[PDB]
Structure 1
Amino acid sequence: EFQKVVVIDAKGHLLGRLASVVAKQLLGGQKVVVVRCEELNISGHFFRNKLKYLAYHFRAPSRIFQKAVRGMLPHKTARGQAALEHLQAVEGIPPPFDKQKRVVVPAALRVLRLKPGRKYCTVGRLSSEVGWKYNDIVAKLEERRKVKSAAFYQAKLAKQKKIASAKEASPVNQKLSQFGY
């Protein structure tokens, strides 16, 4: 299934694997928005990736994730230039996308790709000492949004419980249960 707008949560996702699936999707004429890019993960411990950046200048993981894709797409080709603008990488979950579903990519999930006991690095933690100086405010927004979202979930859960009780109380439900519904 593909949509005109797709929101992908970057928490617990490998950078390269996430970059690959979005690179193909972007060439497919699809708009993809990436949120919480600061919580991306890269195989290899913290010092190695720190040395990698020291050899390498954009401090935003949203820019870094965009930069990784930029060299992973035909940038010279005008088609690649057009597809670049269809990708929107932002840190955290902004209000224009907080009230929308956030899907995940199985091919990039750390739990499905990383062996237990393997060291890994977090981009937001990595970027904190390279020029980024907004971790507190970015974090502060995260708990504020999730607290509001959790309250929304509780209201939705209560509504789901009420309708579920109403659904079971409905005699119509088991009239034609032979269809598996």
Structure 2
Amino acid sequence: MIVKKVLDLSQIPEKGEIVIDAEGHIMGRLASYVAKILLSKPELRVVVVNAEKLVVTGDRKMVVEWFMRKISEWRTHYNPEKAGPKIPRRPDRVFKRVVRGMLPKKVESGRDALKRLRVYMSIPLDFIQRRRLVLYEVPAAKLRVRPLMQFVTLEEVWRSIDPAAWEKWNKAKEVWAKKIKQA
């Protein structure tokens, strides 16, 4: 079964793997905590699930335009595959890139830390099938919901900038809903 817990920022284990449920968390604030955890526990693996439920505060049109500009205007005139940027669009890849920006650059310790992170959209079936799945939340990185506040989810961003890819993933969820519901 799934067991929900609050992550103790001073009682992180030195070994093993912790799973963080990203639902309702602010993307940049959760990334900050995740980046620090990976650096301060060089043997711990961190799994983030439900990455498509991460929240970005601000007006929807403002957030989408920001992503549109990143995936459209940022390019190279040299060999694009050899020298240019490669902008992620899917929420799990987007969030992992956000964490990369909060890790040391061009050093092994920054690279090793990112290799110890896995990000998933929704909850993978193998994680679900486990006898006891412990899912953590980070309350200081959670969105405090207030009236008339604007925000979007990484899933809504993905739908805006890659509709066909989002539709397939959405259909896959429907196809496997019965088996996921069984587990």
TM-score bin (small chain): 0.7 to 0.9
Q: C-alpha separation between the residues in 2 aligned to 1:23 and 1:117?
A: 31
Q: How does 1:24-43 map to 2 (within 5 A)?
A: 24-28=36-40, 29=42, 30-43=44-57
Note the C-alpha offset of 1:45.
1.9
TM-score by length of 2: 0.73
| Amino acid across the alignment from 1:53 | F
Q: How many residues align?
A: 147
Mapped partners of 1:142, 1:64: distance in 2:
24
User: More relative contact order in 1 or in 2 (CA 8 Å, sep 6+)?
Assistant: 2
Give yes or no for the alignment of 1:2 onto 2:12. Answer: yes
Identity %: 32
Cα distance in 2 for residues equivalent to 1:128 and 1:15: 17
Larger Rg: 1
Q: Is the 8 A contact 1:92 1:142 kept in 2?
A: no
Bigger shift: 94-103 or 120-129? 94-103
Report the equivalent of 1:147: 181
1:148 partner letter: Q
What TM-score does the superposition give when structure 1 sets the normalisation length?
0.74
For residues 100-145 of structure 1, the C-alpha deviation after alignment (integer angstroms, 9 at most, x for no partner) is: 121111011113xx54320111110110131233342354268546
Is 1:86 matched with 2:98?
no
Partner secondary structure for residue 160 of structure 2: coil
Partner of 1:97: 127
Structure with more of its chain in helix, by fraction = 1
Distance 1:15 1:142 in 2: 27
The answer to whether the 8 A contact 2:52-2:121 is kept is: yes
- The 8 Å contact of residues 48 and 119 in structure 2, kept in 1 or not, is answered as yes
In structure 1, runs of 5+ residues without a counterpart are 150-181
Native 8 Å contact 2:64 2:160 kept in 1 = no
Give me the whole-angstrom Cα distance separating, in 1, the residues matched to 2:139 and 2:175: 27
Q: Is the 8 A contact 2:20 2:47 kept in 1?
A: yes
1:13 partner amino acid: H
Of the structure 1 ranges 101-110 and 18-27, higher mean CA displacement relative to structure 2 is found in 101-110
Q: Distance in 2 between matches of 1:144 and 1:123?
A: 25
The correspondence for 2:95, drawn from 65, 85, 88, is 65
Unaligned runs of 5+ in 2: 1-10, 71-86
Deviation at 1:146, TM superposition (A): 6.0
Higher-strand-fraction structure: 2
- Aligned-residue RMSD, C-alpha: 1.9
